[PDB]
C-alpha cells in the first residue's frame, strides 16, 4: 500500500528439514487451506527424488530453486503513446516467490497421475536445468535481454 | 457430490439421513 | 448382445459394468451379485460362463429392462398426455413437470436458448 | 439445602446472592459460595430501517445470567429469617433441596 513498505512474513521452519524455503514451497502446493495434504505431497515427492535419484531430496530442491530464480524480468510501463516492455532485475525476495510459483505450476501441467509424483519430477528436471519451470524462467530472461534497449527507462 | 442426495457427502449437505447416511 | 441386451463393459468391475444396462444402477448391481454369488470386484473380462449364465439369468427375469422399460415410461406418459392432466400438459409442451420456476432457467426440459 | 438465582441484571444477581451468602453464613451454618453459572444468550438481529436497506441491521441481546448458592449444614435459624429477606425487582429466586 501507500505509506511504508510491507514486511516480509517469516515462515516457521518445517518439522522435517527446518528450512524456511521448504515451508513456502509447500504452501504453494497448498489448495483450500488443507495444509497437511499439501505437506504430505512435498514429502511424498522427496521419497521419490531420493529413490529415483540417489541423494538428498533437500539439496535437489534448493538447486531447482537456484535454477528457476529469474534474474532480470520485464515490467510494463507506458512511455508516451506506447506500452513498453521495460527490463528490470527481480528483487531477491521475488526471485524466490516466483521460482516457487512457477515450480508448482509447471508441475501441475504434467501427465503423471499423482500430485505427489509430479512435484518430484518437476523438481527433478528443474534441479538440473531442464523442466517446464525453467522454460518459464528461460523465457522471462530472453524478454529482458531482447529489450536491453529500453533500460534507461528503468526506475 | 455435495448435491447428489444419493451419497454420504450429500446427506450431510441436504441435512438429512437415508440409506446412504443412517444414524 | 449379452446381458440383458447390452454388451457390458469388459475389463471393469461387474457391479459398475452391470450399471450400463437401462434399468440397473448401483442398487440393483449389489443385488444380483449377492443373489448369484459373484464378487463385485471380478472383472467382466474374467467371468465364468457359469457366472455369465447366473448373472444374465437373474437380471433378465427379475427387473423390467431396456426396451420394455422405455415403452412403459413412454406409455406411462402416453396416457398421462392423452388423459389430459396437468402432469401431462407440461409433457406435451416440452415444459417442466415438477412445479419448478420457468421464468428463469428451466433449461434442461426446454433446451439451449431460443432468442427473440 | 439450596437457592437458585435467575434475572436479567447482573449488578443485582450478584448483590442478592452476596446478601443471601451473608444471611445464612452469619445465621448458621455452612454456605457453599455463590457460584457463577454460564449465561444463556438470547440475541436479536433486526434490519435498521423500515423498508429495503438489507445490509445495515442493529444488534440486540438479552443476557440472562445464572447464580447458585448452597447453605450446607442447614439449621432452620437461617431458614426462618430467609422469609425475612430483601430481594430487588429484576431477579427471581428458586429453592429446592
Amino acid at each position: 500500500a501507500r505509506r511504508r513498505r510491507a514486511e516480509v512474513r517469516q515462515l516457521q521452519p518445517d518439522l522435517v528439514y527446518g528450512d524456511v524455503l521448504v515451508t513456502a514451497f509447500i504452501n504453494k502446493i497448498m489448495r483450500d487451506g488443507k495444509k497437511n495434504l499439501a505437506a504430505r505431497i512435498f514429502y511424498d515427492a522427496c521419497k521419490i527424488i531420493q529413490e529415483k535419484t540417489g541423494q538428498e531430496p533437500l539439496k535437489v530442491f534448493k538447486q531447482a530453486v537456484e535454477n528457476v530464480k529469474p534474474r532480470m524480468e520485464v515490467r510494463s510501463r507506458r512511455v508516451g503513446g506506447a506500452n513498453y516492455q521495460v527490463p528490470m532485475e527481480v528483487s531477491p525476495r521475488r526471485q524466490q516467490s516466483l521460482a516457487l510459483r512457477w515450480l508448482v505450476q509447471a508441475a501441475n501441467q504434467r501427465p503423471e497421475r499423482r500430485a505427489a509424483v509430479r512435484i518430484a519430477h518437476e523438481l527433478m528436471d528443474a534441479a538440473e536445468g531442464k523442466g517446464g519451470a525453467v522454460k518459464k524462467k528461460e523465457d522471462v530472461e530472453r524478454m529482458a535481454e531482447a529489450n536491453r534497449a529500453y533500460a534507461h527507462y528503468r526506475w | 457430490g455435495k448435491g447428489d442426495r444419493r451419497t454420504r457427502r450429500g446427506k450431510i449437505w441436504r441435512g438429512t439421513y437415508g440409506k446412504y447416511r443412517p444414524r | 448382445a449379452r446381458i440383458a441386451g447390452v454388451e457390458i463393459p469388459r475389463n471393469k468391475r461387474v457391479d459398475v459394468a452391470l450399471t450400463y444396462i437401462y434399468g440397473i444402477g448401483k442398487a440393483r448391481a449389489k443385488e444380483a451379485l449377492e443373489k448369484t454369488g459373484i464378487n463385485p470386484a471380478t472383472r467382466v473380462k474374467d467371468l465364468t460362463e457359469a457366472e455369465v449364465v447366473r448373472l444374465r439369468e437373474y437380471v433378465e427375469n427379475t427387473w423390467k429392462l431396456e426396451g420394455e422399460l422405455r415403452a412403459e415410461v413412454a406409455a406411462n406418459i402416453k396416457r398421462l398426455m392423452d388423459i389430459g392432466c396437468y402432469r401431462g400438459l407440461r409433457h406435451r409442451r416440452g415444459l417442466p413437470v415438477r412445479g419448478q420456476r420457468t421464468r428463469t432457467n428451466a433449461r434442461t426440459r426446454k433446451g439451449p436458448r431460443k432468442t427473440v | 439445602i439450596r437457592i437458585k438465582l435467575r434475572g436479567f441484571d447482573h449488578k443485582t444477581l450478584d448483590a442478592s446472592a452476596q446478601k443471601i451468602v451473608e444471611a445464612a453464613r452469619r445465621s448458621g451454618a455452612q454456605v457453599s459460595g455463590p457460584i457463577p453459572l454460564p449465561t444463556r444468550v438470547r440475541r436479536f438481529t433486526v434490519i435498521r430501517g423500515p423498508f429495503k436497506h438489507k445490509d445495515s441491521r442493529e444488534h440486540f441481546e438479552l443476557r440472562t445470567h445464572n447464580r447458585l448458592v448452597d447453605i450446607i449444614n442447614p439449621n432452620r435459624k437461617t431458614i426462618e429469617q430467609l422469609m425475612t429477606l430483601d430481594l430487588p425487582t429484576g431477579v427471581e429466586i428458586e429453592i429446592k433441596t
Binding site: - | - | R79, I83, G84, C85, Y86, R87, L89, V116 | -
Partner: protein
C-alpha cells in the same frame, strides 16, 4: 404424496353428492370448488364442473383417471404461447 396411513381424501360435501347420484342413477352437472378432492372409482362416468379460479370447467371422468386430484383437469393458467 399424502400419507398412506391416512385416508384417500374427498371433501365429504362432494362424496355425499356423488353417491346421492348413485341411488337415483347418474348423471348431473356437479359444479364444484373441490380441486382438493381425489377422483374416485365412484366418480367414473360423471361430468363434474371443476372450478379453476374463474370457471366451472366441464370435466368428463374415466377409468385411467382415478389416482389424480380434481384440479388436474381444470388447468388454471391460460398460455397460448409467447409472441
Amino acid at each position: 404424496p399424502r400419507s398412506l396411513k391416512k385416508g384417500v381424501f374427498v371433501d365429504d360435501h362432494l362424496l355425499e353428492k356423488v353417491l346421492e347420484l348413485n341411488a337415483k342413477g347418474e348423471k348431473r352437472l356437479i359444479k364444484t370448488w373441490s380441486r382438493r378432492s381425489t377422483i374416485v372409482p365412484e366418480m367414473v362416468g360423471h361430468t363434474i364442473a371443476v372450478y379453476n379460479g374463474k370457471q366451472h370447467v366441464p370435466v368428463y371422468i374415466t377409468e385411467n383417471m382415478v389416482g389424480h386430484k380434481l384440479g388436474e383437469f381444470a388447468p388454471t393458467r391460460t398460455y397460448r404461447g409467447h409472441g
